[PDB]
Amino acid sequence: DPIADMIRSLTALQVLPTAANTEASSHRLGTGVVPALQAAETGASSNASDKNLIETRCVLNHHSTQETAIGNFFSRAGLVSIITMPTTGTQNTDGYVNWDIDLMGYAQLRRKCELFTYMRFDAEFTFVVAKPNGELVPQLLQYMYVPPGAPKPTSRDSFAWQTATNPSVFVKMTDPPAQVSVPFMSPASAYQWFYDGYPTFGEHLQANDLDYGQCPNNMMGTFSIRTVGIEKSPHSITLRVYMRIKHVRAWIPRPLRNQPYLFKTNPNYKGNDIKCTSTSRDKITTL
């Protein structure tokens, strides 16, 4: 009272089940009005439509817009991991495997997710398992989810497999593929495929520049698997993991990856061979 100085979004949602119609138009001849002329410098895309540039007929368009809803674009199971437990070799003659959950190892799904900066969703995981040649044998397996901070099994018979609190699934290689629903688990409000920053404070000496881009809010822990038995199993095992996004929301679209992927954790690209987004031709005046 005795000190006076101490006293939004202009756009929203519409439902568009079908493509816009075309209204019939005729010739327009005059000064002042000029819809064909634009100013791309503004940052806006052109507002001109067919009826302003030509004479149109009427078209009652019933083409649906439903299949391009992000939900239908993403809710299709895709491969996010291939885990192997061979019986001979340097791989894992141990009968168990601990896999750090990182889904950025396969391009098809990755490129689709990276179209957005942030995504929030639930997921359906399907586990397709078989011998490396595709054959199936009566082998009992156990898949266990080990959240960050939970003891990781150190052997085929580590106490951790008691799985008294962690969720585990027991299934036979002969049963259909196991399948479960997973909720949204980040401590953040959304998973983020791009984090322009460092996870901790400190000097960022070239020794720990591998910290750059690592967002802890996306680190979901470990996925462990073993043949259920005190003795070694005679079978090599191939586990393919598929993920299906559901109940999804996405924010901030970005340019799509146009260089092959090199690493799971960063956007590094092969500098000696930078691919052009479009194929080439000889002359700009010839097809």
Binding site: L10, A39, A44, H204, Y212, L256, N258, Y269
Partner: protein, 245 residues
């Protein structure tokens, strides 16, 4: 009446007689964090005019062969004025920005800069050329400070993505024959309500000459580009001693 404009905030005012409108990123004005979204319980400090004002950074020179530059936010201001001081003394920070990029020439010069804001601008390396080396960008490249940095491969934005599609982000163009500045208002974007102004850069500002500068010899050849930015609705929390990084 759309080409003329004035921006006044704090003890600072910008004028322009050759604008091309103003962009409001994703259609949203910056705003202080609301109680429903907040999580940190301490009452924040909202300095107002001492930090929500225009700061002008170092100027760059546009040459017929420039590749393009970029700056990270809030990195650019972590060590400038009262804003920087608040960013250092607090763990938590949050704000929006008004970005005003300036560049004037003459009716006889030509060229076009694309001015864009790219949220979570994560950079990549050329992987030792062959692609067998998993190298990473050094602090100085990811957080260049107020001087900004230079793009080595603008075509892929030093991140394996096409410049051709950057217009999918909030942007404007400075086309010398049309305007002499770009203005973009950016709201806070993040997966958390507040964050560290030191460890995380919310977005990057890119200024790339897509249509190269040109002019007949005899015409002024020093054509600078100047960046002036203003935090909006700056809020801070988690007070303690000052930390630079």
């Amino acid at each position: 009446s759309d080409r003329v404009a004035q921006l006044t905030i704090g003890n600072s005012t910008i004028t322009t007689q050759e604008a091309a409108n103003i962009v409001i990123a994703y259609g949203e004005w910056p705003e202080y964090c609301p109680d429903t979204d907040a999580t940190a319980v301490d009452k924040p400090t909202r300095p107002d005019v001492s930090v929500n004002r225009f700061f002008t950074l170092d100027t760059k020179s546009w040459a017929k062969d420039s590749k393009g530059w970029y700056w990270k936010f809030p990195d650019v201001l972590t060590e400038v004025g009262v804003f920087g001081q608040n960013a250092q003394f607090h763990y938590l920070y949050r704000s929006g920005f008004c970005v005003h990029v300036q560049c004037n020439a003459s009716k006889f010069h030509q060229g076009a800069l694309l001015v864009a804001v790219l949220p979570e601008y994560v950079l990549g390396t050329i992987a030792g050329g062959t692609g067998n080396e998993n190298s990473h960008p050094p602090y100085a490249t990811t957080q260049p400070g107020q001087v900004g940095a230079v793009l080595t491969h603008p075509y892929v934005l030093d991140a394996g993505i096409p410049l051709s599609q950057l217009t999918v982000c909030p942007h404007q163009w400075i086309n010398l024959r049309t305007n002499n500045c770009a203005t973009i208002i950016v709201p806070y974007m993040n997966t958390v309500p507040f964050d560290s102004a030191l460890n995380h850069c919310n977005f990057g500002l890119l200024v790339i000459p897509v249509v190269p500068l040109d002019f007949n010899t005899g015409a002024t050849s020093e054509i600078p580009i100047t960046v002036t930015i203003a935090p909006m609705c700056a809020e801070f929390a988690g007070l303690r001693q000052a930390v630079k990084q």
